[PDB]
């Protein structure tokens, strides 16, 4: 609808440093946009503590049932729920393997931070989300990844929709306060062999790795190339 397109255009122009308040203000203004707007625009990631297993995990709509959220470690909801939504047994095994795989992925590329993977069944395959958050007094920063993958088993076809939110801020004598904030979304597609050679997690991992490397380079070019050249064109 037109109001949704206007909301999405506003989110393209309002300061990305305030994504959460922007969305909240839009939903206050036009409450009927809430569902479609929140499914179209990812929000900054939030961290919770799994006190059962002793591990941090990331929150999103995909691991939410009512007002509880499911830990990928304990596979339990917080606050506990009677019969919350849970992956099938087959997918839970894949989900455990994927969280361990992406912990290693995250360590190797991010050298810290937190990651969570949630999977769910679809009629002809399954889908999943891969979440990664890394944070940085006078030098701060935050990287948030949200990767949504759709898998259609036939061989398998993978569809990946990836959002990265990146912001950096410095406060220094020479340059004063410098703040760079932004959000970028990309998509890619791929058919793959599925075997002990390239199981689903390896196929998904390569897809996510390729996407993040590509997005990182684009962010590098825009943040530290394009806006720098614009600044110098102003004076």
């Amino acid at each position: 609808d037109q109001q949704l397109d206007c909301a999405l255009d506003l989110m393209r122009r309002l300061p990305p440093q305030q994504i959460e308040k922007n969305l909240s203000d839009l939903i206050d203004l036009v409450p009927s946009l809430c569902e479609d707007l929140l499914s179209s625009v990812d929000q900054p990631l939030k961290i919770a503590r799994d006190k059962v297993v002793g591990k941090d995990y990331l929150l999103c709509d995909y691991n939410r049932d009512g007002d509880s959220y499911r830990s990928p470690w304990s596979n339990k909801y917080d606050p506990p729920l009677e019969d919350g939504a849970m992956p099938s047994a087959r997918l839970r095994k894949l989900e455990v393997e994927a969280n361990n795989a992406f912990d290693q992925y995250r360590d190797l590329y991010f050298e810290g931070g937190v990651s969570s993977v949630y999977l769910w069944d679809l009629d002809h395959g399954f889908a999943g989300v891969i979440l990664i958050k890394k944070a940085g007094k006078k030098i701060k920063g935050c990287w948030d990844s949200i990767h949504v993958v759709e898998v259609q088993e036939k061989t398998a076809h993978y569809k990946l929709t990836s959002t990265v939110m990146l912001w950096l801020q410095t406060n220094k004598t020479g340059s004063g306060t410098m703040n760079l904030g932004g959000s970028l979304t990309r998509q890619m597609e791929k058919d793959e062999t599925v075997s002990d050679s390239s199981p689903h997690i390896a196929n998904i991992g390569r897809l996510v790795e390729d996407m993040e490397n590509k997005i990182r380079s684009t962010l590098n070019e825009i943040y530290f190339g394009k806006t720098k050249d614009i600044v110098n064109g102003l004076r």
């Binding site: 929150l59 679809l122 889908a127 949504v148 759709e150 929709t161 979304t185 597609e189 590509k214």
Partner: peptide
């Protein structure tokens, strides 16, 4: 790799509740 062009998959089936922001 390209700009948004196709739909995201549906979320987990049988989920209860509306989408909301986390604070």
């Amino acid at each position: 790799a390209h700009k948004q062009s196709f739909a995201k998959p549906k979320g987990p089936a049988g989920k209860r509740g509306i989408r909301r922001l986390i604070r």
